[PDB]
Amino acid sequence: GLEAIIRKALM
Amino acid sequence: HMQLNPESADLRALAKHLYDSYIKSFPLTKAKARAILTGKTTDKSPFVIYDMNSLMMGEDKIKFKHIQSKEVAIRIFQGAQFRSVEAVQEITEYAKSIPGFVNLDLNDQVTLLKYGVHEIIYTMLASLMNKDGVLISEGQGFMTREFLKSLRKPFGDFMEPKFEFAVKFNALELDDSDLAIFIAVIILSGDRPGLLNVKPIEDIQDNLLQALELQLKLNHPESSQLFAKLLQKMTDLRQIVTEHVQLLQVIKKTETHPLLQE
């Protein structure tokens, strides 16, 4: 959930 | 002795670049938060939630950035968790501006942020807090520490450790220039579990730690060991993230956001 948000926010 | 040399001016430009990036990524700064809390702004005065009646009035007249439980304590906690999601996005956007960070293995980038965002959220909550309460809804609202504390168990104690941290942390009187580097030092912690390449993270942290030390010497003539004191606070923050995580277990197993939906 967190990882998902971070990952898309990063790209 | 300290000298104004090429090495120092690089650390000053690194500090200035992080400040600029910090202002870009976090709309509500400590300077602005302090001007609101101390009534030293021309900006619209926040609505104070200090009891159940002012919360009812407040829910209506403080238009939030998202939106249904019959229970007041659950609706407050929900708003908090939604704002924390927003905060992860802001902190990630900030992380990207730290020189070397986007150059790290994406997996390591995810790990640093995954473990860091909670420590940085408690740091940035302090900016929004005085002894009486916390600015909410990007400063449209103020919720008192005692009203949060009056909420039924286990919600009454969710914010107490943030206020405890904030009373002692705000007494250090850091400004936005100090916090920008502090927050960057926390993101680049080479001891997060499951990191692949530690050494490249410690190299950036070493540069950030040098920049923080110079920032605190120039900016704080009144505390010669503020640098040391600020590292002791990173040691604390771990513990409050521990208490927060174990309380999010109790809640999730004891009770019942649009970007998770998509």
Ligand SMILES: O=C(NCc1ccccc1)c1cc(Cl)c(Cl)c(C(=O)Nc2ccccc2)c1
């Ligand atoms: O908006 C809220 N709650 C919904 C609600 C408030 C009143 C009436 C009905 C619903 C809320 C509450 C609380 Cl204690 C907090 Cl700390 C927050 C927050 O801004 N938390 C926050 C702020 C900055 C960075 C990270 C995290 C947000």
